Symmetry: D2
Subunit: 747 residues, 4 copies
């Protein structure tokens, strides 16, 4: 190709000398377009370069610390221009390196100290900027300023995460996900630090290091990474039935979300809203995804940790670059103070959910994530979220897990972020005023001019000053809850019920979701080396539901005892057997915008098919990847030159939502193992497949009969009807009816 | 089963109370046997518990800091017995947590500060204890005490690593591997800090942060983890042809070793040996694996990062637990001082290898790794290796990469290990005496009694004292190399040759190894978004070898120009076109001992087949895993009860070296998709497969005709010849002749 | 945590108890103690739940707080008796 | 950025009750206090500083290309710290000691630090001896005496054995 024969500018020792100067290609193809573009169309870029027009008050406030690069000299950190950044100073050009090379030592010193401690938990995470706006004033129930006015826009910074794995672990593990939101309000930073399930594993913070140690890699050998599928985790679970509720959620497809865009968020704890009249209302926080709920299947998720361990990080970044912004509705479950004891469960028990059938989630506002960071380390890694960061209008409860959390998230930053001035790191800074009498500490940025560093003081007329509580712009005062009791290390008896919420969850799942839960337990327990641990966990499952317990036992070669078969099922939850809001799929939601289809090309594609396909996908905001057996270009039957995004092996079916095969020269790919496997893998993972013309010959590799089956779209050409059928399948996410057919497929 | 129906001891609120007391099963099945056992037979354990009788002077010296557990009370760090480790102290059992709960706060504080910074590079690694002994005294060439006497045993601690990924990244990535050995000698710690290839990517340490930043996750979004397959890496490579030699090694199967036991190690740099008469000999260091050289194939390695990201860590630990100790022969390439300029390449250039055909590797000694650590964090994570840690009898050279390394590995520990007393962390302590006038620093353990903290001093009669250099037990003195040159930041012109060593490497590979190199480049470059970067790298390949360049270009849809087709090949290396020592496979080596075979069971296995299989494998030290469609047990035709190690999905073919299917009730598994896929995956990855009796029906799924083919062992029964054939195939590692057949296999 | 460089300050020799100390805490900067316990959590079966809680008692018993009665509202308020 | 209503009291269960862990205002304030101190300088820990400016009398371009010396139109801001050597940050000013005189020049072509003392020579010849010399003059390691003084055995021991120090 005339324009695709770029040669390197460096073939000789000029590569070891200063003055390499301009190295970009003359055609400017190094530079991504600063406009929204679909995934894969352009190289990804720092947010301020990709989308400079996207602004909010927090993003604007970071301009003071942003550093450019273009047209600047390369310098030391002291501002000294560097002449030769290719060589150390030596006594002769084959001599020893000299200690007086301060340029070398500065550069290597900085390198040598780049790493900071990762987060103890949730070390793996991906973040973005956005904004929040309430639908209406909530002043009747809370004096929180950010909820006071529908025209009030609050910048946010959100980090999604896994829990167990290190910062370098994989995205699509089976785990709980974190969902942490920093609201930069006019009356302070509010951090809503939640997860993607409505409960936690444990009741009291005192047990957190025990639980976390049990799930983390085992201490002798530091195995396994990003997995609960090991002896110590299931040992703890078997001995602590309080864990069973969140374990059920983790073993469900909730544990393997399709995207951070397609999961729910929950604050878990009951908090309080406090209004201007001092009235407290109990509240639990929810995030409802506009994109709907959707998850992978286990074999897919696991293999995807290999094929693309950055899949969720990548998808988040690319959605934002495409203008396909993650959106979530903030919702409140509201319970009057006088209803504290009206439920079968304790409101303060974080192992219990509040069913939406009993207490609906009331829509409060919307959050949109619309810009990626500039520097991952500076903005994501150094961000500090903490649930003790509340504002006037909010307060805590005595939830004993929450209570201990309040200690931890301040404490941990002292080592992680190097001292008590972590709020001065730019991403963590409030956008509202902050002034007090605190001084010094490592890496102190703020230079205080106050003559006084104490109060009360006369020498600065007692400024800065306390502010009385009030309806707006007032000081923080705790709700005057009545406390009556003896000093005890004692769990509330009201917390001592472990099986009814697991059963409620189980019965709320579709039959295929139940199968996936069974398979989750079965897979994980099969990796437990000590068989008695497997048996003890099966025994716990028998206290939840016998069908569940028998199905798992069968997969483990375990036989239940007669006594286990006669265990009395746990009670309903305030008269509820089930709640369909607990299922990912029972109630259809969301939409296909932002999903992706693989299009398997051949060397003479039927352009009419491809045109129809792409037009229909574009109309619904669905992306496409054009795949082939090599990179470069192929030419369609009408002479259209088609650029190839990836090879079949380079972008496996794991990475897409559906597969379409247009007609053309199908003989080119009919005996290609990778192309056949592409379809078999997608088939096994319940993805929609569409085959046009001679591509219908691929039905043989997936053992589909001439008459066809639901979930396989087929026609003479892609000009139907064909695309409507495929898009309808995509709206339903996966082809659950295919499950009985997949056991015979070798993939 | 009577004995396999263990029920949990906890179904009620006793789980939230003190006094849970004894929880181990009465049958004692929680405890692994303290004797060598094959992989999977027992739970893994800390080394001192698994192998208490395996000792060396370093292991013995750690006894002062080892902490037990059995029969001890649970305490705070201050020694206060804890009564209730289940609950926080609160005002009432539904009340707020109290600040006076010092037990909670201590436990949470320690948890909150568990993490330390990971290594800037080589963050992912796995380590073991062992010992080294020389074969004969090397006193004629070096006064190094640890090489002075064949009966002198030197304890070692070895850490193997990847380079790019975080501590939580996957093992079987495509990367360079580190191979770092701490020798606890009688005259000081010597750290031999090497990699698994004989050269590095860059020439001068000044470029190390540039190179590392280029290969690491890109700074905007922190993608990709554990991969060089991205734009910035290949950008740097295209602009820095000095990198091409180590890039060739990384793109070969050298980049994806089967095990840390089956790779070579290299010091890379030329160092000096100094004898008692003061004579210097140039030396390069080599480790030769007793188990031979062996690598995965890319599709397998990549998928294995998903199925088992801890595969190499696991395999190392389990080999040692089996008594199957990793062994490596230390070897020296020795060059007299007067031969410094004898070769086409500069001896000080770390991008150049010394061909074994020109300078043989002389065997010097043997190292055996024979015990795992007790605590991964304390021993592995906190270990500090540094190539500046040499001893009398060794010295440096002016290699400008080595020269800068000497600065970095001391510097980096100040943040990573929290200050200048990192040598006092138990794993890092010398076993020989260490005394000086250094004092204080964070976490100072040693309490100095010297009246003097300076020298010269009279008040302690000038102790501790300098020691003159001498033949044995003398002070360190540098070799008095003559230095003549001006102070310059300048690369030696002798370093300015970039293509001959890549070409030598290429021509030394077997045809299938060449294919794998082509496919490595092709796969990685296909993931580069900016096409001009791909083109620039292909241009560099055209300066190495046109067959290589054309093959990669074809896979990328790139056309070479007429000028590129006429690039003059680089010269031979001192008359050598090739050197078979550079191939993994050209010269057969190693041993099947420690390899593993999957045995695919059915519900009525022919016991005669299984017994013959297991006996033959055991005789050669090859392990087996018995796999089925569920866990538990199956019963063979003769009533033998067979415990199942894993399911087909739980321990995929990726994790084994070969697959054997005995006869029995083959109908049980003939239509099982997972069992069929097991064989297809193993077939695709070139692994030996053996099929007995009706198991030969599986030939259909791998498209093998009735007449059979090389690499598929088959017979009526698993007789003597059958197992001999299979083991012979295993000795050759993979069935390279099968490569043309795999493109049609959908797996 | 800042003054002595992390959570293992009790391992600095002068600070060490002379009586036994064992628990499930791990890691942290400059960790000296090398734990051999298969378990780093409780409750555990894999080490028969050692080290173990100790009930309160007359001698060698576990720490339990005196069960003082607390009655009042959550307030930031000085006792008038202090004025 | 959260406004404080009562900066006189901890949150407690009753006004004579226990302090509550949920008092984030108390814990933030005390945490910051608890971590105020950073390590002092190994030497010259005691010092006093001020801002100012420097200007050359004439261009020195004939002997140096340093931009800050190139023209009397270059006004260069400075920050200067004067110090003692031996004593801690909390030691006394008018001790018998060498004084440091360190000047940070914020030039248009980088920071130049002129890090000097108030005498024209130093005690020792080779940097390798610096920890020995400094340890000898500093408080003795058994009992950490004396502060801000060379008047003790170890200093004069070193001097007596190292005549290079005499100047
Ligand atoms: C007693 C300790 C403790 C307990 C009981 C919890 N956590 Fe936590 N959590 C931490 C101690 C902690 C921490 C150690 O403080 C982390 C890690 C480092 C950090 O900055 O906070 C953390 C991080 C962390 C993050 C990552 C924030 C980020 O992206 O930086 C999320 C989303 C959560 N947690 C969510 C929860 C939820 C929903 C919990 C229960 C409902 C929970 N944590 C219980
Ligand atoms: C100038 C800096 C620099 C350069 C040029 C190199 N390295 Fe390095 N290396 C480091 C700076 C460094 C480091 C930053 O100092 C590390 C990471 C943390 C540590 O303790 O040392 C390190 C770690 C490290 C480790 C891991 C040791 C362990 O397991 O803890 C190995 C095996 C190597 N390196 C090997 C090499 C080889 C074979 C090189 C070239 C021949 C090389 N390094 C060049
Ligand atoms: C090899 C080590 C070493 C040697 C030989 C010297 N110093 Fe130094 N000096 C340091 C190591 C050091 C240091 C440890 O790096 C300090 C303390 C902390 C710091 O920031 O620098 C320091 C601080 C320091 C300061 C205080 C700067 C400030 O106000 O922050 C002055 C004025 C000097 N020195 C002056 C000298 C002079 C005039 C010397 C000989 C002519 C000298 N030093 C030799
Ligand atoms: Mg032009
Ligand atoms: Mg005693």
């Amino acid at each position: 190709k005339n324009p695709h024969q770029h040669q390197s500018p460096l073939h000789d020792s000029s590569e070891a000398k200063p003055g390499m100067d301009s190295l970009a290609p003359e055609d400017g193809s190094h530079r991504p377009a600063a406009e929204p573009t679909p995934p894969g169309a352009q190289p990804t870029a720092p947010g301020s370069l990709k989308a400079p027009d996207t602004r909010n008050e927090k993003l604007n406030s970071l301009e003071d610390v942003r550093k450019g690069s273009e047209n600047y000299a390369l310098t030391t950190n002291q501002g000294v221009r560097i002449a030769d950044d290719q060589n150390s100073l030596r006594a002769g050009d084959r001599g020893p390196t000299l200690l007086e090379d301060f340029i070398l030592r500065e550069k290597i010193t900085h390198f040598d100290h780049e790493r900071i401690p990762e987060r103890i938990v949730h070390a793996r995470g991906s973040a973005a900027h956005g904004y929040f706006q309430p639908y209406k004033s909530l002043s009747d129930i809370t004096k929180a300023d950010f909820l006071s006015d529908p025209n009030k826009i609050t910048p946010v910074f959100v980090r999604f995460s896994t829990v167990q794995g290190g910062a370098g672990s994989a995205d699509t593990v089976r785990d709980i996900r974190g969902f942490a939101t920093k609201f930069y309000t006019e009356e302070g930073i509010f951090d809503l630090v939640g997860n993607n399930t409505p409960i936690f594993f444990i009741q009291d913070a005192h047990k957190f290091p025990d639980f976390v140690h049990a799930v983390k890699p085992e201490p002798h050998w530091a195995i396994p990474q990003g997995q609960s599928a090991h002896d110590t985790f299931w040992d703890y679970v078997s001995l602590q039935p309080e864990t069973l509720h969140n374990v059920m959620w983790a073993m469900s497809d909730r544990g393997i979300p399709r995207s951070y865009r397609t999961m729910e968020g929950f604050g878990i704890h009951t908090f309080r809203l406090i209004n201007a009249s001092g009235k407290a209302t109990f509240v639990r926080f929810h995030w409802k995804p506009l994109a709907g709920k959707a998850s992978l299947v286990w074999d897919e998720a696991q293999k995807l940790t290999g094929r693309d361990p950055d899949f969720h990080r990548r998808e988040l970044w690319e959605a934002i670059e495409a203008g396909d912004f993650p959106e979530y509705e903030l919702g409140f479950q509201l319970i009057p103070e006088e209803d504290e004891f009206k439920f079968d469960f304790d409101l303060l028990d974080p192992t219990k959910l509040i069913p939406e059938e009993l207490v609906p989630v009331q829509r409060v506002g919307n959050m949109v994530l619309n810009r990626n960071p500039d520097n991952f380390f500076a903005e994501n890694e150094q961000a500090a979220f903490h649930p003790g960061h509340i504002v006037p209008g909010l307060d805590f409860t005595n939830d004993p897990l929450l209570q201990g959390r309040l200690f931890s998230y301040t404490d941990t930053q002292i080592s992680r972020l190097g001292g008590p001035n972590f709020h001065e790191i730019p991403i963590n800074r409030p956008t509202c005023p902050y002034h007090n009498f605190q001084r010094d500490g490592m890496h102190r940025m703020g230079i205080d001019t106050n003559p006084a560093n104490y109060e009360p003081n006369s020498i600065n007329d007692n400024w800065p000053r306390e502010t009385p509580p009030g309806p707006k712009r007032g000081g923080f005062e705790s709700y005057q809850e009545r406390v009556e009791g003896n000093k005890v290390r004692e769990r509330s008896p009201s917390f001592g019920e472990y099986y009814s919420h697991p059963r409620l969850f189980w019965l709320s799942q579709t039959p295929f979701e139940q199968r996936h839960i069974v398979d989750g337990f079965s897979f994980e327990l099969s990796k437990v080396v000590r068989p008695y641990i497997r048996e003890r966990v099966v025994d716990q499952l028998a206290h939840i539901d016998l069908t569940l317990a028998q199905a798992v036992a069968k997969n483990l070669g375990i036989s239940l005892t007669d006594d286990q078969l006669n265990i009395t099922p746990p009670p309903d939850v305030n008269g509820l057997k089930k709640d369909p809001s607990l299922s990912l799929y029972a109630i259809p939601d969301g939409d296909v915008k932002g999903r992706v289809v693989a299009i398997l090309l051949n060397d003479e594609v039927r352009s009419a098919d491809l045109l129809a396909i792409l037009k229909a996908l574009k109309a619904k905001g669905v992306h496409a990847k054009l795949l082939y057996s090599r990179m470069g270009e192929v030419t369609a039957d009408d002479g259209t030159v088609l650029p190839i995004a990836a090879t079949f092996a380079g972008a496996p079916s794991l990475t897409v939502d559906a597969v379409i095969v247009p007609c053309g020269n199908i003989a080119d790919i009919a005996d290609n193992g990778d192309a056949n496997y592409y379809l078999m893998e997608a088939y096994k993972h319940l993805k929609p497949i569409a085959l046009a013309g001679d591509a219908r010959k691929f039905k043989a590799t997936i053992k589909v009969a001439d008459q066809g089956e639901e979930g396989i779209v087929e026609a003479d050409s892609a000009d139907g009807s064909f695309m409507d059928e495929l898009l309808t399948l995509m709206a339903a996410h996966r082809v659950w009816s295919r499950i009985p057919k997949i056991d015979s497929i070798p993939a």
